[model samples]
Target: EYPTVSEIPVGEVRLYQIADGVWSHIATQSFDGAVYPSNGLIVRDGDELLLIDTAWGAKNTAALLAEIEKQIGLPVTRAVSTHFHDDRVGGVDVLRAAGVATYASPSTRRLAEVEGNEIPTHSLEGLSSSGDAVRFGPVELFYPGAAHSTDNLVVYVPSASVLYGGCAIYELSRTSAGNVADADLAEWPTSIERIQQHYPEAQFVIPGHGLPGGLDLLKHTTNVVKAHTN
Candidate 1:
């Protein structure tokens, strides 16, 4: 397990350092009477930082960015949205305004455009299909086919042997397939298998909404997806 170095709260969000230069940023959003959390990553990239995803929205993302500089003492130079959902890319406008170069997969960009959501400034066209992994700073962006969302991608920190599964992977305790409105149930199982085969060395797996776990998390998620399908 990658022990946390620190936990800092900024408004409705919290930042946790899970590895040497890797941090997990979680934001909370309230709806009805319950609260939901969205997870993202903040990785050290040389002198600057690389953000994996954004907060729930522009305001939350802006606050998180300011806090990152005040607490981590580094500016985010580049970022990528795992998917086109609001929880993943809603803060893209803020990132652009802050002069940060933001990116999204080709499918993610197109989905965002069609869904009338904020889009990233650049396109990660190289990762246009599954089984593709591209290096971005100290992290590798990997596409494992359609799972939670058609464009959902995972980020792997080879140095730390950690996998940021975004929403494509589920927390071990998750018994339900949270949101499947945009999910490809048929391909989801195969995608999880692909991740297992590709990153068998992953010591820590961070879900998009819960605590990090080991490879068992993948197995649990596969079971959950299977349960949901049947």
Candidate 2:
């Protein structure tokens, strides 16, 4: 069973550990009385930490950083957003101000600029196709084509055998496509297939907004995406 090292709620964010050296950070945004949670990863690499996605916004992300420092006692040196959405890059400015190097796909950089969200500092411009990846120690960011968004990336932690699917892969409990406003419906299933072909060893799969699961989560997302397609 996966163990929880520490779990704490910092304002609208909750930081918790999901695996050895890997923690899940969740931040919430209330819309029309519905609380939508966004999930990201806080991975321990060497002496510092690597963030997959930031908190919902600057204030919440700042709180998340403080909690990480107090609980894990490690400096966050690197971060990568899964996509160009605000929930993905909301804390980018704060991370930049703190001297943390941030990375994202080239599409993310371009779309983020177009969307006017805080842009990541660096782009994984070399990764152009599905399975193409850039590594940060054991952490790997794979571009599986367009899924939930044109720039969505799936992050894999080889050492932990965990896949941070972000919004591209949904939780098993999710029944409907939460947001397809910027999704590529035609490419979504193909992207999931790419992820399946590439990362069969991923045991702990984390979604963008729900509990972590196994390979079944990937299947569930594929089915959900297929059902929504016309």
Candidate 3:
């Protein structure tokens, strides 16, 4: 597994790099008595930033933006949602207000539009398979495919060889229960294998929640998914 930081901020970004480039921002919970606080990440590339997931509510989104402004002079150029979960995509309005373009997998975009979910569609966008790279300053986003949700996607930063696996699967022991609700369990393992095949040299693996990890972490996640499917 990976280490946890109470708090770490670089320039205009404050992050808890659970592993390496994978990070989470500090934010309060909207739901009462939530055991863990919500967080997100800001990836930097020269002067541009790419946001992984926005936090739970407007206040959290504002705080994240403020934190970035306080540390870096860069503006968020792109934002992506790992899935359609409210906790992950709830802050689209905040990003749009700041002129950031939010992107998601095709399925995720459709879910937000038709489900009457909180995911903001006006500012929502979709990713295409035409190109394999999404560059912003120095950060790069590589899509791995759908796993956790119909539109679940993974992001990778080649510069750091850091792989961000958003809720594709959590570390084995961290999650209280596994989710098969929106997952393609049969395809999840293959999806991960695809990521490993593509990013063969990846050194760090970051999940949506829990600590960041390495190669062994991926194995652990895969094993857990396989067990659940059985």
Global lDDT for candidate 1? 0.86
CA RMSD of each candidate after superposition: 2.9, 2.8, 4.7
Q: Write the per-residue lDDT of candidate 1 for residues 59-94, one digit (tens) a residue.
A: 889988987987898989999999998888898999
- The TM-score obtained by model 2 is 0.92
Worst 10 residues of 2 by lDDT: 1-10
Candidate 2: tens digits of C-alpha lDDT, residues 137-158: 6598898988899889989999
Residue runs of model 2 more than 4 Å from their true location after superposition: 1-10
TM-score of each: 0.93, 0.92, 0.77
Cα deviation of 7, candidate 3, in Å: 8.9
User: Model 1 clash pairs?
Assistant: none
lDDT of candidates 1 onward, in order: 0.86, 0.84, 0.63
Best candidate per lDDT, number? 1
When summed lDDT is taken over every stretch of 10 residues in candidate 3, the lowest stretch is 3-12
Model 3 TM-score is: 0.77
For 1-230, candidate 3 gives per-residue lDDT tens digits of: 23232332211224555434335564545343343344456677456777888765566677788877775557878787767876577778888888888776666777866765556443233344422445544445554555676676677777777777777746545633344676777777777777777777878776666666676666677787787777
Instruction: Give the number of the best model, judged by TM-score.
Output: 1
Which residues of candidate 3, in runs, are more than 4 Å off?
1-14, 17-34, 37-39, 118-140
The best-first sequence of candidates by TM-score reads: 1, 2, 3
Off by over 4 Å in 1: 1-11, 31-33
Error of 2 at 220 (Å): 0.7
